Each structure stands twice: as C-alpha cells, then as structure tokens.
Amino acid sequence: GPHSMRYYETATSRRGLGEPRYTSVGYVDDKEFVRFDSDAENPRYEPQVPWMEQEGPEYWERITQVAKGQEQWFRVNLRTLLGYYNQSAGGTHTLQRMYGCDVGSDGRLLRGYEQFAYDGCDYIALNEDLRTWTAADMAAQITRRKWEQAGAAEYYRAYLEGECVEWLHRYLKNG
Amino acid sequence: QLSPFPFDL
C-alpha cells in the first residue's frame, strides 16, 4: 500500500521572549510517532508510539541535537521575514515547515515535500518535479531566487529520494 | 534521521 512520512516544524515568536516557541511532530501515515516541544522542562524528541521504543538512545540524541539547531534556524529566519514583510519586531508571528515523502507499494518515492507557510499563509513550496519552486508573493520571490541560485531543490531532493524513503521503510518494519 | 539543515529564507 501507499505510505507516507511527514514532519511539521513550527515556530511561534512571542512578545518579549527572545526565543520563539518551537515544535516538531512526525507522522508515519496517519500516526504521530515522534514529537519535540521547546516549552518542555527538558526539550527533547520523545516517542508517541510503542513501536518507537526500539530505537537506541543514540537515535534520540542526534535527533534532539538536530531539533536544537532547527530552533536556531527558525529564530533567525523569523527575523528575516519581518524584514521582507516590513513588520514590527514587537509582535507575534508563525513560521511552519513541512517536509516528507510519499512512497508507492514498490517502496520508491512518488511525491516529495518541502514547503513553508508564514502566519498561516503560503510562502514557498517545492513542486512535484523536485526541481522548481512556487513562491506565494514578492517576498517569497526573494527566497526562490536565492534557492534557484544555491541549488536548494537538488539539495532537498537528495534527502527526499533517499534517506526519507529509507527511514520510512525502517519505521514501517517497526510498526 | 531528519532533513539536513535547510538553506536561508
């Protein structure tokens, strides 16, 4: 059958607090299997399903390290969006990222995802071809241009077509 | 294993 893996990373900036609230949730098909929350006392990726209990502490460690870097990515990129949209630095804003892979019955990639939404609205999205981007407005046009120039599609495609698919199969065997 | 580190916006 057709399976999918999806990650949703969201960061919400608040008034006064220099660190935005950052969350990340993973899904294998319909089921949420992993979650990281920055509000927690000891922020880390914790399993949300019994079949994820069979991953070593090394898995949870690097995954949490990555999450820590993602927070920093969001922190900086929320600020650049303020500049793009000419918004006040004393407000509340949200940036959401979603990426993942849909695999066929033959375990091969069908559709890869890499997309961002700012303040609930569209920002930029990698197309089905995994070669081009759809920018929502003029601000997202600045990102498209630099990502076209930097080869961002090729970069994301490498992950989506390999490691994403391979890990999905791994999790399916676990479940 | 998560996505590699994303490019600047």
Partner: T-cell receptor, first 111, second 110 residues
C-alpha cells in the same frame, strides 16, 4: 572574493596574550564559521554561528571564545594564546550548502 | 562524517589530464564539494554535487563524478596548466552545514 574579509591578516602573539580575530561578510548569510589550518592541510572547525547572537562550539573549541554581535561580523578570541594555537585561521559564511572563505589570518604564538 | 583523499601528493606534466581521488563514508545523504587553495589564500569552490546528474561541471575546466556504489567523488581536468598547482580539498556537508574537509592533495604541474 572580497565578500568575506578577516582582520588582522598577520599576527604575532606571545604566550598568554589575549587575541581577537575579526571577520566581516557582505553576503548576508545567516551562518558563519571559524576554521584553522595548521600545515596547509585539513581545515578544522572551531566555532560556528546560526545568526546574530548565536555561538556554537565546533570540533576543536578548547582555548577559544566566539562572538556574533551582528549578521556581518563574527569574531574569534583566544583568551590566553598558547604555541599550539599558531596556524592560519579561516572564516566562512554560508546560506546553506556552499561555504565562502576569507583569505586567512596567519597567527604565530611565540614559544 | 568523513572524506578520504588517498593520494596526498600528485605530480603531472603541463597539458596532461588530472584525476584526483576522494572517498566518503557518510550514513546520511552525501553533499560533496571540491575546493582549491592557492598559497596565501582561502579555499575556493570548484564544484559541488547534491543530486541528479552524477557528472557535474565546475569552474576553470574541472568536472567531477559522483558514484554512490564506490562512495567516491573523483575530480578531473583534461589539460592542466601550471597555474593549477595548488592544494585540492574534497569536502562533505555536515551538521549546521559546516563542511568537513579531506586532508588535501597537493598538485604539482611541471
């Protein structure tokens, strides 16, 4: 490329001296990195930064301090210079994937 | 994670072709780069590989070939000039997009 520039270009320090290396980039890249290369061989990561206010220990952070006060500036401080810290220091900026390097800073710490 | 450049030094005649070896060992997705470094200068990008065509064209007559099976990213130039004498570094992208460099290969063109 004159987009990433370092200061000073050359420095001779005495053991125990506090030394600060400065890096300016005009690329508007969020990420900045400090490497050192001892014998024209492997560059090793000392410190890096995700953006203003961010400072992260690299592979070999012992003996250094870093400071990212703004987007364009990333400084590296040797608090108490030791002879083992003589080498060529390289700063880089990146928006992801490709790093862009400065021309280097030659630092000699006297034995 | 790591890249290995098996030949530390290469000597070739002016006008000969050049072939520099690089091997990587990286569980994750391999983002590969070749840089050149001339005396008193920093590393300069030659080319990179992310995905797609395994043969990539680069600056100043260089090209490279990615091979997943052999875990290699060999660099090539058909007709080297004296000005190509330098140190060549293979690199792989890691955490926070910091590059991890190979030990380098010094090229001498007689």
């Amino acid at each position: 490329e004159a987009a990433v520039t370092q200061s000073p270009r050359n420095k001779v320090a005495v053991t125990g001296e506090k030394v600060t290396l400065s890096c300016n980039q005009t690329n508007n890249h969020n990420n900045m990195y400090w490497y050192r290369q001892d014998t024209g061989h492997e560059l090793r990561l000392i410190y890096y930064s995700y953006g203003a206010g961010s400072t992260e220990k690299g592979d070999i952070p012992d003996g250094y301090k870093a400071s990212r006060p703004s987007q364009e500036n990333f400084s590296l401080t040797l608090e108490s210079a030791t002879p083992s810290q003589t080498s060529v220091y390289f700063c880089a900026s990146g928006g992801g994937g490709t790093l862009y390097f400065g021309a280097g800073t030659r630092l000699s710490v006297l034995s | 994670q790591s890249v290995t450049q098996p030949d530390a030094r290469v000597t070739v005649s002016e006008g000969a072709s050049l072939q520099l070896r690089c091997k990587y060992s990286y569980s994750a997705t391999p983002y590969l780069f070749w840089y050149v470094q001339y005396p008193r200068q920093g590393p300069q990008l030659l080319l990179k590989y992310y995905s797609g065509d395994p043969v990539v064209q680069g600056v100043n007559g260089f090209e490279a070939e990615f091979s997943k099976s052999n875990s290699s990213f060999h660099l090539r130039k058909a007709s080297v000039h004296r000005s190509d004498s330098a140190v060549y570094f293979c690199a792989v992208s890691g955490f926070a997009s910091a590059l991890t460099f190979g030990s380098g290969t010094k090229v001498i063109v007689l």
